[model samples]
Target: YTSFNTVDEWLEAIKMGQYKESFANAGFTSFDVVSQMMMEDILRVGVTLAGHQKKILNSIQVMRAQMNQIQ
Candidate 1:
């Protein structure tokens, strides 16, 4: 598996790079943190578009699962 330095790079990999600022500005600066967010958190981070929400949340889960295995 590949490792990323920040949440923004992951977002970029999935083409959701537009929200990097949205996430980083709100303290979700890494996969470790971003992986912990629920859609409510994403919503709180200002991601209101439904499609983007779904895609971002989906990717978040994948990253979360991956992070879980890396210990």
Candidate 2:
């Protein structure tokens, strides 16, 4: 499982690659923002590629599910 303790880590895990800067500029450089992110939020950040967005959302869901198991 991916351990996204910080935005930096999350950024590294995403398929954004060069588009990572866009996410940062869009104020997604924090765990709080990512944790609460929705599809609309991702689109607002200029991530129009459905596959990339899906990957990120899936990872986020996995993280949340793991957290729930731990709790």
Candidate 3:
């Protein structure tokens, strides 16, 4: 449940590394902002593929859990 300093690092770990640019450009560059993202926001951030959306959403849940422990 370790948190990375940036979206790129964390997303890369989750295998959704390709979308970091999309996420960052969508005003979600901070890892803190990312923890609050939902399924709808995932789509809004240009994640058109369901598989990528599912993968990112799952990782968001993991990130939320990590925040719970560390926060």
Candidate 4:
């Protein structure tokens, strides 16, 4: 379980590695019309997390290739 001080902090955490935390910190305790909004928000955050992971992995691969060329 990850914790964050603000929405921005939580968002950054999601980008780094906490998709669950992104939904947990959403403050959606009621199952009402607002719940629909919460679900949409979660989906967007999940996409961001996926994009972040892909970008980081690609960066690592690029660095590894550069090191191999130098060796």
On TM-score, who's better, 1 or 2? 1
Off by over 4 Å in 4: 1-48
What TM-score quantifies how close candidate 2 is to the native fold? 0.71
> Best-fitting candidate, measured by TM-score?
1
lDDT of all predictions, in order shown?
0.84, 0.72, 0.85, 0.43
Cα lDDT tens digits for candidate 4, 2-39: 25434344335446445435544555323221123432
The digit string of per-residue lDDT tens for model 3 on 1-71 reads 55566788888888888888888889998767888999989999889998988888888888888888887
Q: Provide the lDDT at 20 for model 2.
A: 68
Instruction: Give RMSD to native, each candidate.
Output: 1.3, 2.3, 1.5, 13.7
CA displacement after TM-score superposition, residue 23 of candidate 1 (Å): 0.6
lDDT of 1: 0.84
Regions more than 4 Å wrong, model 3: none
Pairs of residues clashing in candidate 3: none
Candidate 2's C-alpha runs over 4 A off are 1-5, 68-71
lDDT of 2 by residue, 18-40 (tens): 55687778887765567677888
lDDT of 4: 0.43
Reference-based lDDT, residue 34, model 3: 89
Query: Which residue pairs of candidate 2 clash?
Result: none
In candidate 4, where is summed lDDT lowest over 10 consecutive residues? 28-37
TM-score of every model versus the real structure: 0.88, 0.71, 0.85, 0.33
What lDDT is reached at residue 10 by model 4?
Answer: 36
Worst 10 residues of 2 by lDDT: 1-10
